[PDB]
Design an enzyme around this catalytic site. Structure first.
Site, PDB file in Angstrom:
ATOM      1  N   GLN C  41      51.450  65.145 -90.416  1.00  0.00           N
ATOM      2  CA  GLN C  41      52.755  65.273 -91.062  1.00  0.00           C
ATOM      3  C   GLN C  41      53.868  64.791 -90.132  1.00  0.00           C
ATOM      4  O   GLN C  41      53.872  65.103 -88.943  1.00  0.00           O
ATOM      5  CB  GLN C  41      53.007  66.716 -91.511  1.00  0.00           C
ATOM      6  CG  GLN C  41      54.475  67.070 -91.642  1.00  0.00           C
ATOM      7  CD  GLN C  41      54.710  68.528 -92.058  1.00  0.00           C
ATOM      8  OE1 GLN C  41      55.707  69.145 -91.668  1.00  0.00           O
ATOM      9  NE2 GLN C  41      53.798  69.078 -92.856  1.00  0.00           N
ATOM     10  N   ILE C  42      54.801  64.020 -90.687  1.00  0.00           N
ATOM     11  CA  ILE C  42      55.935  63.474 -89.940  1.00  0.00           C
ATOM     12  C   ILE C  42      57.230  64.158 -90.367  1.00  0.00           C
ATOM     13  O   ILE C  42      57.447  64.391 -91.570  1.00  0.00           O
ATOM     14  CB  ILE C  42      56.073  61.970 -90.186  1.00  0.00           C
ATOM     15  CG1 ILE C  42      55.225  61.192 -89.186  1.00  0.00           C
ATOM     16  CG2 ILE C  42      57.501  61.535 -90.041  1.00  0.00           C
ATOM     17  CD1 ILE C  42      55.554  59.716 -89.149  1.00  0.00           C
ATOM     18  N   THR C 138      57.580  81.230 -81.393  1.00  0.00           N
ATOM     19  CA  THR C 138      57.571  79.851 -80.916  1.00  0.00           C
ATOM     20  C   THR C 138      58.991  79.314 -80.742  1.00  0.00           C
ATOM     21  O   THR C 138      59.905  79.770 -81.430  1.00  0.00           O
ATOM     22  CB  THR C 138      56.753  78.955 -81.878  1.00  0.00           C
ATOM     23  OG1 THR C 138      56.615  77.639 -81.330  1.00  0.00           O
ATOM     24  CG2 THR C 138      57.402  78.897 -83.253  1.00  0.00           C
ATOM     25  N   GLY C 168      52.680  78.666 -83.192  1.00  0.00           N
ATOM     26  CA  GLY C 168      52.345  79.326 -81.949  1.00  0.00           C
ATOM     27  C   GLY C 168      50.850  79.333 -81.744  1.00  0.00           C
ATOM     28  O   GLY C 168      50.324  80.124 -80.962  1.00  0.00           O
ATOM     29  N   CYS C 428      42.955 112.265 -77.966  1.00  0.00           N
ATOM     30  CA  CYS C 428      43.007 111.235 -76.935  1.00  0.00           C
ATOM     31  C   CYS C 428      41.834 111.436 -75.983  1.00  0.00           C
ATOM     32  O   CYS C 428      41.603 110.634 -75.060  1.00  0.00           O
ATOM     33  CB  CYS C 428      44.318 111.337 -76.165  1.00  0.00           C
ATOM     34  SG  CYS C 428      45.233 109.791 -76.066  1.00  0.00           S
TER      35      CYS C 428
END
Ligand SMILES: Cc1ncc(C[n+]2csc(CCOP(=O)(O)O)c2C)c(N)n1
Ligand SMILES: Cc1ncc(C[n+]2csc(CCOP(=O)(O)O)c2C)c(N)n1
Ligand SMILES: Cc1ncc(C[n+]2csc(CCOP(=O)(O)O)c2C)c(N)n1
Ligand SMILES: [Mg+2]
Ligand SMILES: [Mg+2]
Ligand SMILES: [Mg+2]
Ligand SMILES: [Mg+2]
Ligand SMILES: [Mg+2]
Lengths: 504, 501, 502
Positions: C41-42, C138, C168, C428
């Protein structure tokens, strides 16, 4: 190992480490300049880092010795001794010379930066094998020295002669480039004609060059030439008075050539100066605009006439003067100053550093001042000026004196002229700026600068007598003068004219 | 004219021209420092015109000679010869030493800036009447040069392994009254035979509004011989710690209720405060810069340091100094140390901030600190104890304790008692040790207290391991045993055996 | 001239003109990427655009690959381009279709399901493919988000619409993207991957491309150095015994990133299980820690540590293929916690995720059949082993042997293995237990069995403690003790907890 007398100061390259273009090394530049000239080399800089210094100095000493040229160091005397250098250069604010001599012992060249005659006196009270050579002041402005004219260099060469410091060579330094090297070599001579610069120093012109080989080849070309044909007119020395037939030829030529004479002046003279020019059958232009200046000078038989205390910036005067010298066209310098006020003296002296003048015209005061100094006195002064600025000088008064100091445009290293202040040609005669400008303006390549100036002085002086007779006061005198100039030149019959031309 | 052996490196003043306060001259400062110490003087000028340099050098040589002290120049060898100076100093990046010797000829002192052992080797491959003295690296950070003690020791050690008997040493860089005694104290050869011959200052005297006073102070510190860095006894004890002594320690700490400041992780925060509580003293978990001087001012305060902590080096520096100023004890218990590149870095930086009363590590932590079996561990433990002039504890099957304080003794050049012959005996612990030392009165003894602590801890351990049902209860039974054990001082009872190493 | 179905979205190169390194041309880069992978793609002056587009269409056609243009539809028609891409704020899609007429590929930037709905009520030969949202941050202009979109493409049955992921994407996250970007029903995944800066801005575009190709046409993402084999047979006593032995012998280093309540209690559990805890939250240490043998990461939330370092740590462990356990103290408890947690789940691949009924239902984006459905949803969504704690603890294995593919995509949420563990009425702590069991496993081990082993062990220690204690206080310490005693004698045949199928 070289000795004092083996040192060739011709083209003296002084390095500067933080000025080299990208992708080029100091070794690289200094190499290029050795292959094309420069009979000497000095290392500085630091970036010190005294150890990297020593490594670079040795690396470069091999290069120099390879090409049989000495290496000089500044101002680290210790590094000098340590690497077995061939000499050292120190400045006025560095280690006192005697102290240096004591550490390095005889045999080693000692260079000293000198900008004033006062320092030549000191240099002399110390006698030989103390100071061996000197770098004369900073000739022109430059960005290379981080803090800090030819007239000034002359004062120094003159002190080297008055003190008979036969043992001390000289190189000129600071702002030297192809656009001013011949002019520097040409007018940097002792007043007695016996001494000139033994060589030329460059830093930025070679070091900072994208093509150091070429740049150097160019400087070499200039240094070992001997003629500076600074204007496209003859410069031959003429000892025979200017004949009526020659004056006639001059006037014809300028009438036929319709010279374009650019006036740079204040105002009072703007209008009166353009009238004289018109009368002499040539066209005046009163441009003081920087961009026009190169186009103006390109026009056939163009001529520059300078006045002073003008509204024009030094930056443009410099631009104009250079513009004309580049096309080898004549400049006439007619100070409205000069030395009349502190400010004028300043500006005028600065002007005299911008280029080579074909003629300088002053009155008794203007002239004595320029000579840096009655009737025998005015003559001595006139020659001094003519010789100093290597130009034809005119001194106006009852008698007008003309002296020819161009010496056929001759220069040399050390020699220097073959011809002192005392023995150049000087003749006597019993608005003038524009007159002179038009006579010189009309001359063809085969003409003669000196005869033209004399012709002009004669013409002017002639028109003067005529006007003073036909007038009723100051007002009509002015217009009758222009008229006389017009009539006089429309009939070339100098056999007629009043003024008598003798030898001085 | 002086010779090598007439040079007194005691207090060595190095000038810097553009650092003098207004209304004061370089002559003025150097004068004040000569009238009160400065036993040697160096002039620099990297920025001036070489002629003004020479005039100032002569002007100042008269002053020095007047007070019978040599003048050294750097790094202009030429100016040195020209004015008949007494010596020259050059850096690592200046003119090579052999070249210099050739120009100035024998008789003249040659100083060399040295920061690494590698450069001591080179200095040695050149033999005598080449390098005469050296300025050891940059000890601490400083704004004076335009571009620690552990490091200086590595250099003094190379001067000994190479037997460069002919080369004196001065320490330089960031030296001020707040760290001069500590520098003199711990900058000694590992074999105890060599220490700094003197101390170099620039800003401390030059940049001073009262140079006379500043100098009188540095002199005071240099020609003293005791660094009592903590208000506890530092006497060397060679007789094993008796039961009656252990009993006295515990009583004292119980009666004095020491305030123990923990700077630590988060796993050790809670468990460490429990041990402290059990031993009858109060924990504080402040990591705040402004509080630090007030905390340390409280009676019987004590600092316990852990590592890989969330606290900025700027504050650790602040805390460590805070306690050393009031002569209170610091215990260094690296959670690092050398476990990761980042930890090694931070810990070594910590060890430059001040004087520690005790350093505690395990076999790895210790071998690492010693810069290096069961005999090996002993050698290492002494190495560390001696290196950081502190009581060092190495935990394991056997716990080893070594006393490298040497009664807080320092001297110039001498410097002592080697790594090999300091006392070393054999037998949560960080906090235990912190409380025992914390409780001691001026007449106490640092070494006995640490041993007491190790004994107590080891004792509580056996008891707990027996009364517990796993990792969980072990932890709480240990705290209990610590509590019970100290509420009845009867060390004659306790399991752990204390021998000589 | 290509048609819809000849379009290969595998490695889809999107150019950006002002991002090319000196001494390199757009032609140069696009050439290098065509010789090693690459659809294209341009994206100055509209005339220079057209000259560059033609120049580049020759190159693409030369390599038998279509050229797409964005968003100048006119330039598209003018140069006879093979398709056009438009964004959400560009020309409406119907208008575009009317001008370019059928046959031409129309790409649409889509970041939300809402936009998939619109794409669908328009039917076929309107939108042909979509670039899914911005996956990661990005400078040029998460997977959970991409999934919501692939799910809408399925609920709407938009069979005609391909998908590429974009934004990204680099070698450090491409396999993880391919791996977890799948429809919930397992029938659909990304048809390809879009890059700009990874190839365009590269000093060596040939090499960069060869690398992206390697990743895309592989099929295994072995994200941890433990076995990922699907096990359908309940975890045998002999297997649990082997697990515990391994971890005791391997003394795993377990890095806790957690609060301050759990710091101490978590280190005790770790100690009891015969492994060493480290409580480092320092960015520089993180790569060194993970390099140590049998290292393991345990994450908690609402922590004082900056997102920049959590990202750093999670990546650090995934680079060395070591296990991460995610035990949110959040999660979705407050608006701020939800935010940070979701951001964490984009930083890398987790070996296990552990939550309670709420924590889990939340993660599943949604009783007792409900909890089971939720647990699988989570396990499948994040391609991980998921644990849901309660009276019954449920464990589901969504790793699918670390398998990924283009478009395919796999095995739905509904049919991955899920087991249960009960013992009777009774945090935990389990996180650290699980962390130690997984930590001990050798290359030939099995992630799933280890987790189950961990849940069993913990649950077992719980009954024992609840009996031997006098309240909350002693319960805590008796639990640590039971964990210690239980593992020092590997006799799982003994332990209380009952392991069934779900
Ligand atoms: C032989 C000698 N004479 C004088 C000096 C002092 N000096 C006058 S101006 C200048 C540089 C101008 O270079 P440029 O304008 O060609 O870039 C320097 C370095 C010296 N170092 N050596
Ligand atoms: C003997 C000797 N050793 C080393 C050097 C180089 N040097 C390293 S640090 C320092 C500045 C410290 O100032 P302050 O004490 O104010 O921090 C300088 C001057 C030298 N010039 N002379
Ligand atoms: C097919 C398609 N899908 C989406 C967009 C919009 N878009 C989202 S992120 C991105 C840049 C990523 O660069 P990097 O991989 O270097 O981060 C752009 C151009 C588009 N123009 N075409
Ligand atoms: Mg230097
Ligand atoms: Mg005048
Ligand atoms: Mg200087
Ligand atoms: Mg430790
Ligand atoms: Mg939770």
């Amino acid at each position: 190992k070289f000795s004092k007398e083996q040192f060739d100061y011709s083209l003296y390259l002084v390095t500067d480490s933080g000025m080299i273009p990208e992708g080029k090394t100091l070794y690289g530049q200094v190499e290029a300049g050795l292959q094309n000239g420069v009979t000497l080399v000095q290392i500085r800089e630091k970036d010190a880092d005294t150890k990297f210094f020593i490594e670079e100095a040795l690396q470069i000493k091999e290069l120099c010795h390879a090409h049989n040229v000495p290496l000089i160091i500044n101002d680290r005397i210790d590094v000098a001794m340590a690497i077995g250098a061939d000499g050292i250069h120190v400045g006025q604010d560095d280690m006192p010379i005697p102290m240096i001599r004591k550490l390095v012992g005889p045999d080693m060249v000692i260079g000293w930066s000198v900008g004033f005659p006062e320092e030549v006196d000191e240099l002399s009270k110390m006698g030989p094998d103390m100071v061996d050579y000197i770098g004369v002041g900073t000739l022109f402005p430059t960005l290379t020295k981080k803090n800090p004219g030819t007239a000034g260099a002359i004062r120094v060469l003159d002190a080297l002669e008055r003190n008979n410091a036969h043992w001390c060579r000289t190189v000129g330094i600071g702002g030297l480039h192809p656009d001013n090297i011949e002019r520097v070599l040409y007018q940097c001579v002792s007043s007695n004609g016996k001494r000139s610069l033994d060589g030329i120093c460059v830093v930025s012109d070679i070091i900072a060059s994208l093509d150091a080989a070429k740049s150097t080849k160019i400087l070499r070309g200039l240094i070992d030439k001997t003629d500076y044909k600074f204007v496209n007119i003859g410069l031959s020395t003429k000892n025979s008075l200017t004949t009526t037939d020659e004056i006639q030829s001059i006037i014809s030529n300028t009438l036929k050539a319709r010279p374009l004479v650019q006036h740079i002046t204040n105002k009072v003279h703007q209008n009166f100066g353009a009238n004289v020019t018109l009368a002499l059958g040539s066209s005046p232009i009163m441009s003081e605009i920087q961009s026009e200046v190169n186009d103006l000078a390109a026009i056939p038989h163009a001529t520059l006439l300078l006045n002073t205390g003008s509204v024009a910036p030094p930056e443009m005067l410099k631009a104009a003067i250079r513009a004309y010298n580049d096309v080898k066209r004549p400049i006439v310098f007619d100070p409205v100053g000069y030395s009349a006020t502190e400010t004028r003296l300043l500006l005028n002296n600065k002007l005299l550093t911008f280029g080579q003048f074909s003629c300088i015209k002053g009155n008794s005061s203007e002239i004595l001042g320029l000579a840096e100094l009655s009737n025998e006195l005015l003559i001595q002064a006139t020659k001094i000026v003519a010789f100093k600025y290597k130009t034809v000088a005119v001194c106006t008064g009852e008698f007008d004196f003309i002296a020819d100091g161009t010496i056929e445009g001759k220069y040399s290293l050390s020699k220097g002229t073959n011809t002192s202040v005392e023995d150049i040609p000087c003749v006597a005669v019993e608005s003038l700026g524009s007159t002179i400008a038009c006579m010189i303006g009309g001359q063809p390549s085969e003409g003669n600068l000196f005869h033209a100036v004399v012709a002009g002085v004669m013409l002017y002086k002639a028109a003067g007598k005529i006007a003073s007779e036909k007038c009723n006061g100051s007002g009509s005198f002015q217009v009758e003068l222009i008229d006389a100039l017009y009539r006089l030149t429309r009939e070339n019959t100098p056999v007629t004219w009043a003024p008598k031309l003798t030898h001085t």
